[PDB]
């Protein structure tokens, strides 16, 4: 990141070891003015020892703790360190973090760099004794995407397969590469690169017709598995800006959409890479960023530039809003299909008004119930009945058969069974006496 290292070589050896060859300035090998030994032995044998504690050597860098290389050395049965600087080659052998010999000079050269090869200890790692190709491949690929011009070479001495990645398009090209197995909806990809209040941000996002959410949280070329505050600000900014756009354009008024945050991020692939001078990570794995000023900066930048994008491209804006409305209508249609059946499991209509005309008496086993045609018969039936112990329930046409189409969910009227019992019956035995009047024709 200081603009000196332009080539990094990672080689997987057959003896279960990985060597990292870079062409940077090189690890300092001089005698430390306080420890008494070479700075390499200091950073290998002392926790929280290095030059990443300020901006004097590294203005912007992802490493901020100072224990990582010590962890790599200690959890390895053996480690070889070759450092090239000032025309001298410094070599030292480590075993379980214990230096076997002081840092000695083996020769001279004109290049500058550092070789770090370690044999990982089997006493700590279980069920995984061999390095996996796919994870390292993805890591180096995305690293080459986020680092334009930095050549990254991966060698594998186990099978001879070697790759070289020197992408210069950036995270835009990264998103384009990740959209090779998908189907995007808009050609123009949202992309920018700003730097406000000492903190830089670079986000590239693109909507695709899939249904998987994959927002790669990157902070100083470091992936965050658990996201962080920057991810929360990203999501909040996207949600609020999309809501404001759909409200001011009238889509939420035409479609009556709540437009929650989860529907706004449905089928979206984002790559958020921020540059922070002094970040804050909750662990060494750097899975979460806990810097809220970065959250606010990224939120403001996303709101501003995403509103600009949505108001400068009418076609892409229309397509994105249509996809968001499609996802929201899918969610609410599923909510309908769930709670409508949940209510059909219970009784809500009850068919009490409209047609049912009970009597004055409320004690069952004293009143009577009848079932006739509604408009043709029920009128005269009510005009000629009594108002003491008489009740009539009209009907409409015919009733579907039970055996021909048996379905516990199929229901059209449901008024009869709901008004006579609760549908089970020993509890409510209202209208103990029922009489069915019917015409003398064949349809009767």
């Amino acid at each position: 990141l200081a603009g000196h290292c332009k080539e990094i070589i990672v080689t997987i050896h057959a003896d279960n070891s990985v060597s990292v060859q870079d062409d940077g300035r090189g690890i300092p090998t001089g005698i430390h003015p306080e420890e008494g030994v070479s700075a390499a032995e200091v950073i290998m044998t002392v926790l929280h020892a290095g030059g990443k504690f300020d901006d004097n050597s590294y203005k912007v860098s992802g490493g901020l703790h100072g224990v990582g290389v010590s962890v790599v050395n200690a959890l390895s049965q053996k480690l070889e360190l070759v450092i090239q600087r000032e025309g001298k080659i410094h070599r030292q052998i480590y075993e379980h973090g214990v230096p076997q010999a002081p840092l000695a000079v083996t020769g001279e050269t004109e290049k500058t760099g550092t070789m770090v090869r370690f044999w990982p200890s089997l006493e700590t790692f279980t069920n995984v004794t061999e390095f996996e190709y796919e994870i390292l491949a993805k890591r180096l690929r995305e690293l080459s995407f986020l680092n334009s011009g930095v050549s990254i070479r991966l060698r594998d001495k186990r099978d001879g397969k070697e790759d070289h990645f020197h992408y210069e398009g950036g995270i835009k090209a990264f998103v384009e590469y990740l959209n090779k197995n998908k189907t995007p909806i808009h050609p123009n990809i949202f992309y920018f690169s700003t730097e406000k209040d000492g903190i830089g941000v670079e986000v590239a996002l693109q909507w695709n017709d899939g249904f998987q959410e994959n927002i790669y949280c990157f902070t100083n070329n470091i992936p965050q598995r658990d996201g962080g505050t920057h991810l929360a600000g990203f999501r909040a900014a996207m949600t609020r800006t999309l809501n404001a756009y759909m409200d001011k354009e009238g889509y939420s008024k035409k479609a009556k959409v709540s437009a929650t945050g989860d529907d706004a991020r449905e089928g979206l692939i984002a790559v958020v890479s921020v540059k922070v001078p002094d970040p804050k990570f909750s662990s060494q794995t750097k899975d979460k960023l806990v810097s809220s000023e970065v959250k606010s900066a990224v939120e403001q930048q996303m709101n501003e530039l995403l509103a600009e994008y949505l108001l400068e491209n009418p076609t892409d804006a229309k397509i994105v809003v249509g996809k968001i409305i499609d996802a929201a209508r899918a969610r609410e249609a599923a909510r309908r299909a769930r709670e409508m059946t949940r209510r059909k499991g219970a009784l809500d209509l009850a068919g009490l008004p409209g047609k049912l005309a009970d009597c004055q008496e409320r004690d069952p086993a004293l009143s009577e119930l009848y079932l006739v045609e509604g408009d043709s018969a029920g009128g005269s039936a009510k005009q000629g009945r009594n108002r003491k112990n008489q009740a009539i329930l009209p009907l409409k046409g015919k009733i579907l058969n039970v055996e021909k189409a048996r379905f516990d969910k199929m229901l059209s009227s449901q008024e009869v069974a709901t008004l006579i019992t609760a549908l089970y019956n020993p509890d409510k035995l209202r209208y103990h006496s029922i009489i069915i009047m019917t015409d003398a024709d064949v349809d009767g």
């Binding site: 300092p28 003015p33 504690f53 050597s57 703790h65 060494q284 806990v290």
Partner: protein, 50 residues
């Protein structure tokens, strides 16, 4: 750029390493997670004693 030497390697003695990078030792110090994690660790030590 070019400020690299043995003096650039800084070693934090005592608890200076924890105060310099509280994140890997306490969590988040802004949302209130670490302020409660203080008492969480204290009470967990008490329960481990119990």
């Amino acid at each position: 750029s070019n400020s690299y030497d043995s003096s650039s390697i800084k070693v934090l003695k005592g608890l200076d390493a924890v105060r310099k990078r509280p994140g890997m030792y306490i969590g988040d110090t802004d949302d209130g997670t670490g302020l409660h994690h203080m008492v969480f660790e204290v009470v967990d030590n008490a329960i481990d004693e119990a």
